[PDB]
Amino acid sequence: HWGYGKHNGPEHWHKDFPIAKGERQSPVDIDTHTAKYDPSLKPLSVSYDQATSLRILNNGHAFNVEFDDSQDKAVLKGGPLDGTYRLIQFHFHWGSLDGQGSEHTVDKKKYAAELHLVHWNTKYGDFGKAVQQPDGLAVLGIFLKVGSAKPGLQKVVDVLDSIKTKGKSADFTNFDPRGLLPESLDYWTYPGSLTTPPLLECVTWIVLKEPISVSSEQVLKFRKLNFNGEGEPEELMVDNWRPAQPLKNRQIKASF
Ligand SMILES: [Hg+2]
Ligand SMILES: [Zn+2]
């Protein structure tokens, strides 16, 4: 199936997912000179004080920290959005080296990693219905650079041990996502898609200007994960990022 290797990588995704060549693909390079300041864009509203994390799972392409979205406990609203979006899960994309790992690029600059906070439009009732709508999902994208440790990320780091291989899961309660947020909420927004198959063009991307820094030892731990299932030949989970796609007919707006 699809993956990130030279034989099943992003360059091959179109064969099974023709929308890989669609008009609103993600990620893209954020050219800051061309992005347009939109004074009509409201401030982001992040309400995560009632967030209920449940578990973490190695899905074979990343590790997802899953949230209870049966009620409006952790929501995203405002910015360029109309309505309430509920947090379903958060995951990352990282590199084999500190010089790459992010999906989105700013002036072609790649970061060490990229965090994606996935939310679905509550007017569609379920995540699976939201995925059939142009305004179905809202993804908060946060860049990671190597520097000082991110205090807030250590519980995630520490549990990786336990979900080393694909299909493995561990209980993961009382994790507060607020500890992964940069100080500033300034952002860039554009209409896009999922970055992995099925690549559905249902996303409203919100990529924060300010990166969060993490230590070298923290990102090191992410690189110890495996794409493979237990008892299979070891393949380190590294470089699980999709390169920039053509902006085509779109406008990147800035909140600042
Ligand atoms: Hg869609
Ligand atoms: Zn992602």
Residue 81 phi/psi, 5-degree rounding, is -95, 155
Is 7 marked as binding a ligand? no
What's the CA-to-centroid distance between 241 and ligand 1, angstroms? 21
- Distance in angstroms (rounded) separating the CA atoms of residues 73 and 48: 7
Tokens standing for residue 199: 């690549």
Q: Which residues surround ligand 1, an ion (CB under 5 A)?
A: 200, 202
Longest dimension (CA), the chain: 54
Is 196 marked as binding a ligand? yes
**CA–CA–CA angle 181, 123, 91 (5° rounding):** 30
What's the CA-to-centroid distance between 145 and ligand 2, angstroms? 17
What's the CA-to-centroid distance between 60 and ligand 1, angstroms? 24
The ligand with the least distance to the CA atom of 94 is 2
- Distance in angstroms (rounded) separating the CA atoms of residues 5 and 172: 30
Q: Which residue in the block uniquely carries the two structure tokens 């569609």?
A: 124
SS3 per-residue string spanning the chain: CCCCCCCCCHHHHHHCCHHHHCCCCCCCEECCCCCEECCCCCCEEEECCCCCEEEEEECCCCEEEEECCCCCCCEEEECCCCCCEEEEEEEEEECCCCCCCCCCEECCECCCEEEEEEEEEHHHCCHHHHCCCCCCEEEEEEEEEECCCCHHHHHHHHHHHHHCCECCEEECCCCCHHHHCCCCCCEEEEEECCCCCCCCCCEEEEEECCCEEECHHHHHHHCCCECCECCCCCCECCCCCCCCCCCCCCCCEECC
The ligand with the least distance to the CA atom of 115 is 2
- Distance in angstroms (rounded) separating the CA atoms of residues 160 and 183: 26
Is 34 marked as binding a ligand? no
Among 87, 115, 121, smallest CA distance to 101 is for 115
Q: Which residues partner with 191 through β-bridges? A: 204
- Distance in angstroms (rounded) separating the CA atoms of residues 238 and 184: 29
166-205 b/e with 16+ CB inside 10 Å = b? bebbeebeebebeebbeeebebbbbbbbbbbbebbbbbbb
Asked if 35 and 247 touch (Cβ cutoff 8 Å), the reply is no
The ligand with the least distance to the CA atom of 136 is 1
Residue ranges of the domains in the chain?
1-256
Which residues are designated catalytic? 61
- Distance in angstroms (rounded) separating the CA atoms of residues 171 and 65: 10
Domain at 1-256: CATH architecture: Roll (3.10)
- Distance in angstroms (rounded) separating the CA atoms of residues 116 and 135: 17
* Residue 247: C-alpha distances to residues 27, 35, 123, 142, 194 (Å): 9, 12, 28, 20, 15
- Distance in angstroms (rounded) separating the CA atoms of residues 42 and 83: 13
Among 252, 250, 249, 130, smallest CA distance to 200 is for 130
The dihedral formed by the CA atoms of 102, 106, 110 and 111, expressed in degrees to the nearest 10: -60
Among 167, 155, 170, 222, smallest CA distance to 55 is for 170
What's the CA-to-centroid distance between 193 and ligand 1, angstroms? 8
End-to-end C-alpha distance for the chain, whole angstroms: 41
